[PDB]
Amino acid sequence: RLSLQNTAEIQHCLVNAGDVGCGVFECFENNSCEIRGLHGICMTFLHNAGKFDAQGKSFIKDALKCKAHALRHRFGCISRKCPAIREMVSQLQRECYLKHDLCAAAQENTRVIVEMIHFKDLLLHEPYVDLVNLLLTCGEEVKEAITHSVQVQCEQNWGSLCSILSFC
């Protein structure tokens, strides 16, 4: 159900905006599909890229390049349906994270990745949900730290709601 003029303007982005930099992901936002946070994703991670170590910086550069390149190339025959858009975006995220070794950067910067994740942003946008889903399968200590952090923010922002959702 994506708008045709939205398709035209987004392909104008991809043909004009270069892969390096968030501008491609800058204008992926405000789409009809309401798949938001890519602005937030790129801004937050590039703000905190310095806090990431050298391996973290290498991983974030590789992941940003992969995301831009794959979302430029694979944006072809995808159907107009927004759920399909989100589904293919999820596959692109998964591939870019898995083949660029996100989990090791998670071990090396457990505190940092805890720092970026904010419960409001996790609730609002799907890509953060995908990130935390992969985080919970990227290391026992890392998944434990992520669960502790999400419990802390969940409780402090939702009151008894957090225990209501967390039966166990």
Partner 1 sequence: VCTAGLKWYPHPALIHCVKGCEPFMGDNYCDAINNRAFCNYDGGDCCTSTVKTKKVTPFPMSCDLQGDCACRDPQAQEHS
By CB under 8 A, name the binding residues for partner 1.
18, 20-21, 43, 46-50, 54, 57, 61
Among residues 88 and 136, whose Cβ is nearest to a second copy?
A: 136
161 part of the interface to a second copy, by CB under 8 A: yes
* One of 26, 136, 139, 155 touching a second copy (CB under 8 A): 136
What's the CA gap between 157 and 154, in Å, rounded? 5
Tell me the site size for a second copy, rule CB under 8 A. 15
* One of 11, 91, 157, 166 touching a second copy (CB under 8 A): 166
Closest Cα partner for 93 from 119, 75, 67?
67
CB atoms closer than 10 angstroms to residue 12: 11
Half-sphere exposure of 41 (CA within 13 A, CB side): 29
**Token code pair at residue 123:** 């609730």
Q: Please name the residues in contact with 127: beta carbons below 8 A apart, sequence gap of 6 or more.
A: 35, 37, 38, 41, 89, 93
123 part of the interface to a second copy, by CB under 8 A: yes
Among residues 2 and 43, whose Cβ is nearest to partner 1?
A: 43
How remote is the C-alpha of 1 from its chain's centroid? 23
What's the CA gap between 101 and 99, in Å, rounded? 6
Which range, of 5-13, 35-43, 58-66, 152-160, touches a second copy by CB under 8 A? 152-160
Locus of tokens 């390049």 = 65
* One of 51, 132, 139, 155 touching a second copy (CB under 8 A): 132
Among residues 57 and 86, whose Cβ is nearest to partner 1?
A: 57
Q: Residues interacting with a second copy, by CB under 8 A? A: 123, 129, 132-133, 136, 147, 158-161, 164-168
